[PDB]
Every structure is written in structure tokens, then in C-alpha cells.
RNA sequence: UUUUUU
């Protein structure tokens, strides 16, 4: 499933038709397969910026402890090179970043 | 009172309650005799025993309020008779011996109160009273260790580190680090113990000095500050921002910055006086802290620079109030300090008036060192060396342990001056050795090693010895700054007399590791002669 | 949220317990509430505000 | 059933040490919308809170010793601050200068207020008298006297005619401006009140005491109109919202909490601070609260109408 | 009281620094200032009594 | 021909006031036999068990207050101590030389315990964290931390991955030093604790009581395996012997009992030490003991295998 | 082995 999905992407991204949903049928692979897609970085530096002003301004309300936990940081990772996860086993605050 | 004892005049005085409020409402006004025969009154009818152990401590306080001491020791030993003891007599029995000066009684009640006594609950008050029974002995050592034995037991009870902060302060203030850690843990442990903890921070704070990291929002006006918000009551609050602000100047001129929080003592010394004026009784305290509050504010005018307001403020204390040989004290430092701070040379009938008044109060080491530095102003040298001699005798004799020190520094340093000028009759070098060899008796002073150093390279300036006494002053860490740039000057100096390139240029590093501005300078003038 | 729907229905149940007459588990269920959100559980949503 | 109530911003480390006053004043009449803070430094650090966070504009500062009390006045760009230091100087707002300097000593003032008017700047002392001064116009006109103890609370009803005084020991002490005569001393708590507030329209006054319960007296009797204790610790704040139906109050617990007149009950508490906070406020039409506290922090929260 | 009268030279070097010794604290910790002047101790009547 | 526990020594003034903490370190093993102690008097002194007796080697200090607890590693000749104002000291052991001074807060610090590699010296705090200080390089590697009371003692597993904590308020949290994971927490008791022993191949853990119990529970469950009863006041030391066979415990009613744990009942009993009894050690083997009492006399008893 | 509300 891994090099099917970097295949798929890999003729995905020749053309342009990139904003692509995917629908799994249950959470684990959900999570799985975008932990282990792993190298695309589909996005420049201008967008960089803009991803990380708006969530860093977003996140930063809430306390110290609440703001390095394992899901937000790992989120935070795929959500910088331009990648999210939309299951239902996740913190609403991080589904509506992603949305 | 005399509402409550009308009250109680209109009832038929026939039950236990209403000749028990009777009495205490009476000995609350005064009239001890009449509270004591209501008291028997109320003895008569009486079931219960508890109560009747209660009815006979009342009667011992109320008859010791007169005096009659004796009759009072016999009827709490008639109380503890009954067949259980109330935990209540046996606390004033213990106070009753305190407040005569003899430990005999005091520890056989307090044995009697620790053997079969658990049901008390408080854990503060035996401590305190077992305190107190030592400090009476003078022991003055034992206090602490006492303190800190009960805290070991219960490392809990916030009042018991509180107590032990307070004790250091007072007893042994040469804990003064661990006394400030001791009431940072009693503050911490709570909220509402904070107004104590925070002042007895604080004076701990005072005492250390300025032994920190040069650390902001942790000195000692901070936390004294943070007290003053917390209670705004207490006199003790008001006389300790007076001692943090002129401690805080003194620092800051030793770093050479600026001086800063210049003119608020007379404000301070308002604010003590109104709140000191509705605390109930503990008069002798109450009288000690105006008048250090007194002689603090006098000072710190004196030494910001306004002279006058000092003066006014001297004669009006005098114009309340026949003489006190204290204040006048104040009065001749205020008005001698004009006249010298210009040269002048002063006649013998105001000199000899000056000493005469310090005699007047005598048993107080700063007064004989204020005025050994008068004479060593004008130069009478063993005048001020006589001076300084009767200081440290009462010193010693007083058990105190700073004023020994400061008293021997001071002679060291009076000796050096004289030895500077190349004076003849070379016996000034001998006081200098006498003078620091009991220094470092008592302890381990780096001014008295620095000012051997000096005696050495002035008097025989010689090659090695001097040279290794200075680098062992100058290169073993744990020196203050100050001490070691002029140990390491005067080693440049002679260092260059014996010529060595290398050598000087590793002292030129070990100032480079530092910060410095004058040795170097002065290398690079003194490089090219 | 499972959290989330608790301290919701302890909190019906402070409306309850006051109609029915049951004035200790009303001062239980308003304590129960009152010590169940603290944190990113109870985060505000990004649309709502 | 509540409302949606929330942070809005966080600024992280304002002062240097703790932050002991803070005063939220809607003064222009445009929306400027200036927030000015004092601490244990000599700053009377001057913000704005513009459109969603709030920009530094002044530092100014000539105190000596910790601020205890700032103020702002509702007619004029104008602040009033008294510190350790016994002084009250009181500032400019508008080119960040000192204007004058009024020496008054812990026998002359500790805490702060200004007039409805903004004229007059009373203030609590020692001995317990309340001190009025004047601004723009010299010191020290009269002097209201209540014969009690050191003096920490001082109130000014919005509509005048009413002045308020609490004390360390819990009494409580109801003047009127028109003459100066006391019109009734409640008994109130029983240890050190230094909080009071009236309500828009005068006739509701809240205390606050050491032990952690909240008097709800009224005016013009004696009657009080009920107890709410939900802290923990000291109460050290209590500000009445601009409607006449809920109030803010801070505690020494480290914790905001709002209740409602109405039914004497506590709506939301707010759990962020980490310290001791020592300051709550409203904002003009009350619907955000401002909150400093004893770790250097301020806080804006968002109370919706 | 023997001599009644000291005469010496102020400025004997102009090299070489005077002895300014202030007092900070009870527990002994003193320090080494420049200009000269009086000694200067910090609380000279002693701790306030707390 | 019985060999009976001997009393075999009695040192009379080993300190000037109450001794608090006695370790026993066979580090060399030709005659150094090091024993430690520390005693209220703000010194820490070096004995060595020479031939029959113990001869003084050197006092050393720096301390403020009393000194409250000292250790002595295995591995490594090396010291360390702590005092009640929170100040950490390592010992040389060979020059005494204060190797390293580590300090520490007004809460970080109550008693001391080495890593068995000896790295680590794991420490108690008055507010219930257990924060761990790297030897020799490091100050505050991190802080492993619960939520609860005052923590008295403090245990070390020998194998490792555990690490047993009591307190004050009388319950026990085991950590694994893997991750900083809580295993399990057991009540325990409703009174304090002051000390907590594992065994080697640590499989039981040994806890003492104020109330003068002493409870056995096994490391893989919390099962309260055990209870003895035969102190009559506070249980104040508990130490175990290089083999898993049996105990000894040092009362505050001046008796120090020898239990075991395959019978639960005392095989002896030691009447000695007039003042109440603050610590016991075993030394390599199962041979001698070492009890340092609130009188200041140190007794060297004996105990075959 | 997906999804949900008073």
C-alpha cells in the first residue's frame, strides 16, 4: 500500500489534479498509510510561512503542557509538508486546523 | 468592661456560668481581689473536675497578677493533685517558672507535660516552651538545635519551619542562608503564613548580606517589600524596608552604579511609630523597635545628606523628654558632622565633651567605634587605638561575635594607615600582627589576609615571601573583587620590580578571565616608563 | 468525548436533583461538573469564536 | 446552559515581577480602549488593546518602590498611581509625562480612586481617616473621618453621593458627598475586606474578605442580601459588570470566577492563572475581562453579553 | 591618650590606593572601596528586632 | 556452643548531639569497612571498622541545620549527604574534599539514595516530586513527579526499573526508570512512612509505619503480604541483608527487633540505647550491625549468618 | 470493523 500510494501520487502530481481525498474504511490505516507516505513536501516557502503563523497563532492560546503531546506535534509535522488525517479518534481542535 | 460587670450585677449570682463571667469580667478591669474571691466562689460549687482544675489555674494567674508568687506555685501544685492533670496547668506552670528566672520547676512541669500528655494537639507551643526553658540557661546555641530536632519530627506544620526561621534571626545568626531557606519553605507551604515567614526572610536576608548572584526579584528588598503588601500592620514590617533601603544604597555604591531610594525615612519612621501605637502589650519590644527606629532614621538622613531635618527631629525628641543619654548621642553625631567633612582641627573641650557623652552610654560597641574613628580623624592614633580596645573587651565580654570581628578589623586597618605615612617607633607593625592573628582565630577573613600581605610588602618588601602571599591571595578562588584586584595591583607592581615578561602578562590574562579596567591600564602606562 | 457527554448529563442532573428535593447530591453533581473541565478537552472550537 | 466564555490573548511576560493593579479605561470617546498596570518595579506600564491583542505604548516611570494602586479617569486622558515610595504622582496618558507629584506617606495614602468627575482622587489612610485631594487644583481639602483602623478599600458610587471604606479588621464604613456625614457602619466580615465595589445605578455594594466569603450588602439599609463563598483562599478583587447582573472576582486560589446578583451563584471559573492574581476589570460595555496576576501575565478573556 | 596630635602626608604616592573598608551584613563580609572616605558600614545599629 | 547476638561495642560520644543517619560501605575489599555518619551537629564523619572497633578517620562539614541523611556508594569510593536546608554535598572518602556542591531550591531536596552504577541520586521533596540529580556532571537530569504530600523516604530497586516512594500522608507510588511511567500505587497507610527497603532480586518491599506496623508487599501486585506487631511506639529504620532471609527494625521505644520473613516473628530483640534509635545497617554480609541512637553512642552488634 | 444525538 505504501509504494501504491507514492505511485498514485507520483502520477498524481504531473498533472494538476493534487487535492486529492482519500477514503479509508477504518482509523488505523488511516493514520497508517499517512504516517508512512513520509517524504512528499508539496509545498513552498511562502506557504510555510503562512501555515506556520496561522496555527503557531492558533495554538498558542492553551497552557504548556497541553501544547507538546504526541498527536499535536506529530500533526503539526504532516501539516507543514502539506499533509493531514481526518479520522474520527482525534482532537477536534486539530480536525478543524485541518478543515 | 464596665457594661459586662453592670450585666452581670443585675442576675442572682447562684450558678457556676454566671460567677465564672463575673470573675473574668472583673479581673479583666483590674480588681484582681475581687476576681480571685469569685473565683473561691465559684470553686465552692463545683462538679466535674476538669473544671475544677480550670477554676484553680484561673485562681494562680489571678493572684499572680498581684505578685505572691509562692501562693500561686502552691495551688497549681495543689491542681496537679487531682487525679488527672489538665495539660492546662501544666503549661502555666511551666510559663509561672519562666517568669521567675529558675529552670528547676520549668523542667520538671515540662517532664511531667511530654511523659503522659498526647491528647494535645498544638505541637507548637511545647515547642516553644522548651525553647524558652533553654534560652533561659543562656545556652543560646541549644535554642536552634532544639528547633530544629521538633522540625525533623514533623516535617510538616508550616509553623514549626516559621519558628526556626525566627530563631536563627534571633539566637545564632550565623545560619543566616539556612534561616532564609527555612522561611522560603514555611511560606511555601501555605498562603496564610505568609506575613510572618516573609518578614523573618527577609531580616535573614539582611543578615547574609549580599552573599548571591547578583539575582534580581530575590533580594531583600523585594521580599520585604512583598511582606508590607501582605500585612500592613506591623511595626517590624517598617523598620525592616528602613534597614533594606539603606542596605540597598550601601551595595550599590560598592558595585559603583548609583545610589537610588534616597529620601523616605522620616515617611518610615511615621508609619512605625502610628502602628507600634495600637499593639497591645509587649512594651519592652515595643519600646526597643521605636527606638532603633529613632536612631536608623537619624542615620540615613545623616548619610543621604540632609542635616537639618536630622537636627530638628533630634531637638524635638529632646524637647518631649528630660534627657536620654542615647538620643544625645545622635545629637553630637549631627552636629560634629559638618565640621570635619571640611579639614579642621578641633579643640580639646569639644573633643573632650564628645568623649565624656559617649561614656554617658556606655555598653554599646557602635559608640566606641564611631568615636575611635573621630580621633583617628583628627590623629591621636593610640587614643583610637585605646577606642577600639575597650569595644572589643565589651564585645567579648558580651558574647557577641560580629562587633569582636569588626572591632579587630578596624584596629588592623587603624595600624596599616600609620604604618603607610613611613612613621618611626616601629611598633605598628606588631598591633598589625596581633590584630589579624585573632582575626583569623575566629575565622577564615580575607581583609585580614590581604592586610598581612600589605604589612609584608610595605615592611621588608623583599622578593619571595611577599610575592607568594600575594599570588596565594590572588590565585586561589573564592575571593571577593575588590580584595583581589588591589592584592593583584599591588603583585603587578612588584612583580615588575622583578622583572619577568611572562609572568606579567599571565597576570594581564588572569585580569582579561575577569573584568577589569585599572590593572591593565596601568601595566600599559607603566610599560613604556 | 466521552468526557464531554458526562459533564453535560451531570449537569441535567443538578436540575433534577433540585426537583426532586435533594439538596446533597445537588451540591455533588454541581462539584462534579465544576472539577470535570478544565483543559483541551473543553477548547473552544475555531468557528464558534 | 451558560454562555461561551474564553481567552483572547496572552501576553506572555509583561513586567519584570509581580503585577499588584491594573485599571481598564475606555476614556476617549472614540475607541482607544487603554489599559495601564503597575508592579513591584517603578513601571506604570501604559498598553492599548486595539482590535485583538494588545501593543505596548507607554513605560513611563519615576516611582522608587513597587506600585500598589493605579487609576484612570473616564473624562480626561489622565492616570493617578501610589506606591511604597509615599507619593502619587499622577501621569500625562497622552505624551507619557509626569504632570505632579503629591507626597503622602502610609499615613497618607494606600490605595486609589477618583471622583465620578474625575476631581478628586480620594484615598485610605492609616490612622483612618479617608483623605481627599484635589487634582489640577492643589492637596488636601478635607478629610472624612471613620474612628477605626488602617483603611484598605475606597469606593466611589457612579452616580456620586456615596462613599465606601473597608478595613483590616472587617468593618465597613458608608459616607455620602453631598455632606460628609456617615450615614451607617456595617460589621460586616471579620478579617481585612480590601476590596469593595458599588454597582451602576448605586444600590448594590460587594465586599470581599480575607476569609474567602462574599458579602452582597444594599444601600440605603442595612440589609444584606446574601454570603457566597465558592474560593478557596483570599479574595483580593471585585469588579461589578457595567448591566446589574454579574460581577468578577479573583482570588488568592488562582482562579476567576463570575457570578450573578440574581440568583447568588457562580456561573463560570476561569482555571489559567498559575500565581496569585492580584487584578480583575471590565471594559466599557462589559464583555471582556482583564486579569493580572502574580506571575508576570495579563490576561484577556471574553465574557459575551 | 598619649600623642594629642598626628602630622602626616596625605598624598604620599599618587600611585598607589587607600583603604576603604565597608561592612555588609553581620556575618563577617567585607569589601574594598575606591575614593576615600568614612568606613561606611551597612546597618550600623544592628538587625531591626523582628 | 550458641554464638548469641553480642552487643561487642558501645562508643560513647560519637557527636555532640542526636545522631540522624549511619551508612556502612564495604567498597574495598581489604579492612577499610567505611561507616558514616551524620548527626545534627552539622558534621559528617568517617569511622572505619579497623580490627574489633571503630576508629574516628575525619570529620568533615559544611552544613547548615542538621544533617537528615547520608549515603555511601558501592561501586565507587564516594559520599553524599544532605541537610535540612536543602544542600547537597558529595565526599572524596579519600582526602575529604567536597568533590561537588550541589545546591538546590527551598524544596528540592529530603533524603538521598545513589543509582546501583551509581549515577543518579535519586532525592525526595516536600511537595511530592522526586526529581533526580546526575552525579558529578549534571544538576537536575529531570523530575519525575506524582501528585500528593510531603515524600519522607525514599527507596532504590537493586535490579532496577523501580523506584517506591512514600509519604507523609502514608501511600507508596513505584515508578520504572524506563520512562517515568507510575506502575502501580498502594494506600498503604494513614500515617507516615520514613522508610521503604527492597530486597536483592527485588521481588518484596518492605514498608515501616509510624504507627509502629511494618507491612511486606510483593513488587508484581499489591498484595499486603504481611503485617508485624511487635513495636510499641513509631517504627523509624528498616534494613534488609545481603540475602533474602531476615530484617532489622529500630523503634522510637528504644528497641531495635531482628525479624524474619520466612516465620514473622522476632528471633531477638537489643536493649540498648537509653534515648530512642534513628538508624540500623547491615554490613556486606549478613555478620554485623550497626545502630546510631538520639543518644549519641554508636553499638556495633553481631549476628552470625 | 464504519457512524451518531438530547
Known amino acids: 500500500d505504501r509504494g501504491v500510494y507514492l505511485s498514485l501520487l507520483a502520477s498524481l502530481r504531473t498533472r494538476a489534479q493534487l487535492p486529492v481525498v482519500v477514503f479509508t474504511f477504518s482509523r488505523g490505516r488511516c493514520d497508517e498509510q499517512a504516517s508512512g507516505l513520509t517524504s512528499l513536501d508539496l509545498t513552498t516557502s511562502s506557504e510555510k510561512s503562512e501555515i506556520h503563523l496561522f496555527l503557531q497563532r492558533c495554538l498558542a492560546r492553551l497552557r504548556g503542557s497541553d501544547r507538546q503531546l504526541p498527536q499535536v506535534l506529530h500533526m503539526s509535522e504532516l501539516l507543514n509538508r502539506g499533509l493531514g488525517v481526518h479520522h474520527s479518534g482525534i482532537l477536534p481542535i486539530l480536525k478543524e486546523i485541518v478543515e | ?224 517589600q512583598k511582606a508590607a503588601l501582605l500585612s500592613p500592620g506591623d511595626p517590624a514590617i517598617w523598620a525592616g524596608l528602613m534597614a533594606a533601603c539603606h542596605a540597598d544604597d550601601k551595595l550599590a555604591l560598592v558595585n559603583n552604579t548609583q545610589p537610588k531610594r534616597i529620601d523616605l525615612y522620616l515617611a518610615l519612621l511615621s508609619a512605625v511609630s502610628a502602628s507600634i501605637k495600637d499593639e497591645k502589650f509587649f512594651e519592652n519590644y515595643n519600646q526597643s523597635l521605636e527606638k532603633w527606629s529613632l536612631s536608623q532614621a537619624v542615620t540615613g538622613l545623616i548619610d543621604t545628606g540632609r542635616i537639618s531635618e536630622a537636627e530638628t527631629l533630634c531637638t524635638k525628641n529632646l524637647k518631649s523628654n528630660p534627657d536620654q543619654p542615647a538620643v544625645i548621642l545622635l545629637l553630637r553625631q549631627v552636629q560634629c558632622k559638618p565640621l570635619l567633612e571640611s579639614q579642621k582641627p578641633l579643640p580639646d573641650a569639644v573633643l573632650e565633651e564628645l568623649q565624656k557623652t559617649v561614656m554617658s552610654n556606655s555598653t554599646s560597641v557602635p559608640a566606641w567605634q564611631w568615636l575611635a574613628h573621630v580621633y583617628q580623624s583628627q590623629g591621636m592614633m593610640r587614643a583610637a587605638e585605646m577606642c577600639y580596645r575597650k569595644s572589643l573587651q565589651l564585645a567579648s565580654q558580651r558574647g557577641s561575635w560580629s562587633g569582636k570581628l569588626s572591632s579587630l578589623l578596624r584596629l588592623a586597618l587603624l595600624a596599616l594607615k600609620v604604618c603607610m605615612a613611613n612613621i618611626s617607633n616601629d611598633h605598628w607593625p606588631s598591633l598589625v600582627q596581633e590584630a589579624t592573628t585573632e582575626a583569623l582565630k575566629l575565622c577564615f577573613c580575607p581583609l585580614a589576609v590581604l592586610l598581612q600581605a600589605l604589612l609584608q610588602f610595605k615592611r621588608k618588601m623583599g622578593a619571595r615571601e611577599t610575592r607568594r602571599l600575594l599570588e596565594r591571595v590572588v590565585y586561589q578562588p573564592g575571593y571577593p573583587k575588590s580584595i583581589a584586584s588591589t592584592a593583584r595591583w599591588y603583585l603587578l607592581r612588584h612583580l615588575y620590580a622583578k622583572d619577568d615578561y611572562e609572568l606579567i602578562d599571565v597576570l594581564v590574562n588572569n585580569a582579561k578571565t575577569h573584568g577589569d579596567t585599572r590593572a591593565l591600564e596601568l601595566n600599559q602606562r607603566l610599560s613604556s616608563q | 468525548r466521552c468526557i464531554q457527554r458526562l459533564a453535560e448529563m451531570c449537569r441535567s442532573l443538578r436540575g433534577a436533583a433540585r426537583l426532586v428535593g435533594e439538596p446533597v447530591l445537588g451540591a455533588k453533581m454541581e462539584t462534579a461538573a465544576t472539577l470535570l473541565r478544565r483543559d483541551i478537552v473543553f477548547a473552544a472550537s475555531l468557528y464558534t469564536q | 446552559m451558560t454562555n461561551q466564555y474564553g481567552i483572547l490573548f496572552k501576553q506572555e511576560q509583561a513586567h519584570d515581577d509581580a503585577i499588584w493593579s491594573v485599571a481598564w479605561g475606555t476614556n476617549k470617546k472614540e475607541n482607544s480602549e487603554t489599559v495601564v498596570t503597575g508592579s513591584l518595579d517603578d513601571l506604570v506600564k501604559v498598553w492599548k488593546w486595539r482590535d485583538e491583542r494588545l501593543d505596548l505604548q507607554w513605560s513611563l516611570e519615576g516611582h522608587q518602590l513597587g506600585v500598589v494602586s493605579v487609576d484612570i479617569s473616564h473624562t480626561l486622558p489622565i492616570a493617578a498611581s501610589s506606591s511604597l515610595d509615599a507619593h502619587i504622582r499622577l501621569w500625562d496618558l497622552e505624551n507619557g509625562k509626569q504632570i505632579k507629584s503629591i507626597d503622602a506617606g502610609p499615613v497618607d495614602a494606600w490605595t486609589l480612586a477618583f471622583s465620578p468627575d474625575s476631581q478628586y482622587l480620594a484615598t485610605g489612610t492609616h490612622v483612618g481617616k479617608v483623605n481627599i485631594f484635589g487634582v489640577e487644583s492643589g492637596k488636601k481639602e478635607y478629610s472624612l473621618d471613620t474612628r477605626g483602623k488602617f483603611i484598605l478599600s475606597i469606593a466611589y458610587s457612579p452616580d456620586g453621593k456615596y462613599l465606601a471604606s473597608g478595613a483590616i479588621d472587617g468593618i465597613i464604613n458608608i459616607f455620602d458627598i453631598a455632606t460628609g456625614k456617615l450615614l451607617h457602619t456595617l460589621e460586616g466580615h471579620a478579617m481585612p475586606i480590601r476590596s469593595l465595589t458599588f454597582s451602576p445605578d448605586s444600590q448594590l455594594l460587594v465586599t470581599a474578605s480575607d476569609d474567602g466569603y462574599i458579602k452582597i450588602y444594599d444601600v440605603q439599609h442595612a440589609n444584606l442580601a446574601g454570603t457566597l463563598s465558592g474560593h478557596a483562599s483570599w479574595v483580593l478583587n471585585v469588579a461589578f459588570c457595567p448591566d446589574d447582573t454579574h460581577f468578577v472576582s479573583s482570588s488568592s486560589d488562582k482562579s476567576v470566577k463570575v457570578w450573578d446578583v440574581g440568583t447568588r451563584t457562580c456561573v463560570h471559573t476561569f482555571f489559567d492563572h498559575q500565581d496569585q492574581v492580584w487584578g480583575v476589570k471590565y471594559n466599557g460595555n462589559g464583555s471582556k475581562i482583564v486579569s493580572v496576576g502574580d506571575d508576570q501575565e495579563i490576561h484577556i478573556y471574553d465574557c459575551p453579553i | 591618650m598619649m600623642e594629642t596630635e598626628r602630622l602626616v602626608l596625605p598624598p604620599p604616592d599618587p600611585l598607589d590606593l587607600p583603604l576603604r573598608a565597608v561592612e555588609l551584613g553581620c556575618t563577617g563580609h567585607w569589601e574594598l572601596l575606591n575614593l576615600p572616605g568614612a568606613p561606611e558600614s551597612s546597618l550600623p545599629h544592628g538587625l531591626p528586632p523582628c
Not at chain 2, 62 to 72: C, L, R
Request: proline share 2%.
Open chain 2, 1 to 224: 468592661y464596665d457594661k459586662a460587670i453592670q450585666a452581670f450585677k443585675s442576675t442572682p449570682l447562684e450558678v457556676l456560668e454566671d460567677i465564672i463571667g463575673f470573675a473574668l469580667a472583673l479581673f479583666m478591669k483590674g480588681l484582681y481581689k475581687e476576681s480571685s474571691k469569685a473565683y473561691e466562689r465559684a470553686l465552692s460549687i463545683v462538679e466535674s473536675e476538669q473544671d475544677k482544675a480550670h477554676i484553680l489555674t484561673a485562681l494562680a494567674i489571678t493572684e499572680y497578677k498581684q505578685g505572691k508568687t509562692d501562693v500561686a506555685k502552691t495551688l497549681l501544685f495543689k491542681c496537679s493533685i487531682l487525679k488527672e492533670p489538665t495539660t492546662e496547668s501544666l503549661q502555666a506552670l511551666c510559663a509561672l517558672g519562666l517568669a521567675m528566672q529558675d529552670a528547676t520547676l520549668s523542667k520538671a512541669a515540662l517532664n511531667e507535660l511530654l511523659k503522659h500528655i498526647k491528647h494535645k494537639d498544638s505541637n507548637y507551643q511545647r515547642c516553644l516552651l522548651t525553647s524558652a526553658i533553654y534560652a533561659l540557661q543562656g545556652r543560646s546555641v541549644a535554642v536552634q538545635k532544639q528547633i530544629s530536632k521538633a522540625v525533623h519530627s514533623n516535617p510538616g506544620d508550616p509553623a514549626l519551619w516559621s519558628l526556626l526561621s525566627r530563631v536563627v534571626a534571633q539566637y545564632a545568626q550565623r545560619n543566616a542562608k539556612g534561616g532564609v531557606v527555612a522561611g522560603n519553605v514555611a511560606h511555601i507551604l501555605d498562603s496564610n503564613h505568609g506575613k510572618k515567614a516573609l518578614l523573618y526572610t527577609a531580616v535573614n536576608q539582611l543578615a547574609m548580606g549580599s552573599s548571591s548572584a547578583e539575582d534580581e526579584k530575590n533580594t531583600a528588598l523585594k521580599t520585604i
